[PDB]
Design a protein around this ligand. Structure first.
Ligand SMILES: COc1ccccc1NC(=O)c1nc(-c2ccc(S(=O)(=O)N3CCN(C)CC3)cc2)cnc1N
Ligand SMILES: [Cl-]
Length: 350
């Protein structure tokens, strides 16, 4: 039970460093950036994660910049950040200390799928709405996550609160400056990115969210490509070959083979017989080739598949109340404020 103490700036708040003490630190993850840890704050005993990434001096970290300006019930909070050096030579690490949320949609969905069960539709509605809520929030800032996938959706199994995490691929999408095409995890990678587009939009996140919805409905990934290019083949096996005009809207500069001519597969045959009609309906307005065709995250939240969540009597399966789903801020409703009439049901207004 060793106690580590660091001088950390508060996450959102003002640049006033304070000493923060934590203990009980375990490795829990890693990647190309560095290592991820769990720890307990000696103060409040609250659990936290710490993403530790090698940060080159003299050049700013865009994940930190993006995270300092986010504050949303469905996004993991950046509580503190701090620097530290070691294990290496004259290298500086940036540490993000984030709220710890214990579960992920990936692990949940794997447990049902291993037990050959479908995750109940109520959980599908709860997870997907909160994911769409977080997207509406970051997209109103022009920030695009670029890594929506089941492992980056944290869950509290008791409150069913969902929080979006891992902002190591997020970027301010600025109009006219290009962006890299090979982002997003393969299975959740939108088609314009596979077509090499570099002027894509936030709707690549909405494609990803549709892949997750579809995956929850089906109990397995809906487009499991065994490469960056075979991903497109899997997509085509459901949506059929994209029309010449659809290829233009995805990226207006391309010749990728020509693909064999394949008919679109009807959405009803894509899912299992007892799949709810509004789930399939919602899904088909997300998994569209034309990136302007897809729903915005707010419109998705307004979808009728989510109406059970707007019911005043709804409860979680463990008898408890649903998390807070109607406290929209004006920034959240900014893209389409009229949608408030559907999104804040009567029983939830003041
Ligand atoms: C790999 O993680 C990242 C990579 C990049 C950026 C951010 C993150 N993570 C987070 O930000 C974050 N992660 C978690 C989190 C939750 C569950 C898991 S677990 O795999 O289910 N598993 C690991 C082993 N353990 C013994 C049990 C549970 C892993 C991690 C919680 N709260 C967070 N804030
Ligand atoms: Cl909020």
């Amino acid at each position: 039970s060793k106690v580590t103490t660091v001088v950390a700036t508060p996450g959102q708040g003002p640049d006033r460093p304070q000493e923060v003490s934590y203990t009980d630190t375990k490795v829990i993850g890693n990647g190309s950036f560095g290592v991820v840890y769990q720890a307990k704050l000696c103060d409040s005993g609250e659990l936290v994660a710490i993403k530790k990434v090698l940060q080159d001096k003299r050049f700013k970290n865009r994940e930190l910049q993006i995270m300092r300006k986010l504050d949303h019930c469905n996004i993991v909070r950046l509580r503190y950040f701090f620097y530290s050096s070691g294990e290496k030579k004259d290298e500086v690490y940036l540490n993000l200390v984030l709220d710890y949320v214990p579960e992920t949609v990936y692990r949940v969905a794997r447990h049902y799928s291993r037990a050959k069960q479908t995750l109940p539709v109520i959980y599908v509605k709860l997870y997907m709405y909160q994911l769409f809520r977080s997207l509406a929030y970051i997209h109103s800032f022009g920030i695009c996550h670029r890594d929506i996938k089941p492992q980056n959706l944290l869950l509290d199994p008791d409150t069913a609160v969902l929080k979006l995490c891992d902002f190591g691929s997020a970027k301010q999408l600025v109009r006219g400056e290009p962006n890299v095409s090979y982002i997003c995890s393969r299975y959740y990678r939108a088609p314009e990115l596979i077509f090499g587009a570099t002027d894509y939009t936030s709707s690549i996140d909405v494609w990803s969210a549709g892949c997750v919805l579809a995956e929850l409905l089906l109990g397995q990934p809906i487009f499991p490509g065994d490469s960056g290019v075979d991903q497109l083949v899997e997509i085509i096996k459901v949506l059929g070959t994209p029309t010449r005009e659809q290829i233009r809207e995805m990226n207006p500069n391309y010749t990728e083979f020509k693909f064999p001519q394949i008919k679109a597969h009807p959405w009803t045959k894509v899912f299992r017989p007892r799949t709810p009609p509004e789930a399939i309906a919602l899904c088909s307005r997300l998994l569209e080739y034309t990136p302007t065709a897809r729903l915005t995250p707010l419109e998705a939240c307004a979808h009728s598949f989510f109406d059970e969540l707007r019911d005043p009597n709804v409860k979680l399966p463990n008898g408890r109340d649903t998390p807070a789903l109607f406290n929209f801020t004006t920034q959240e409703l900014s893209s389409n404020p009229p949608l408030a009439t559907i999104l804040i049901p009567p029983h939830a207004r003041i």
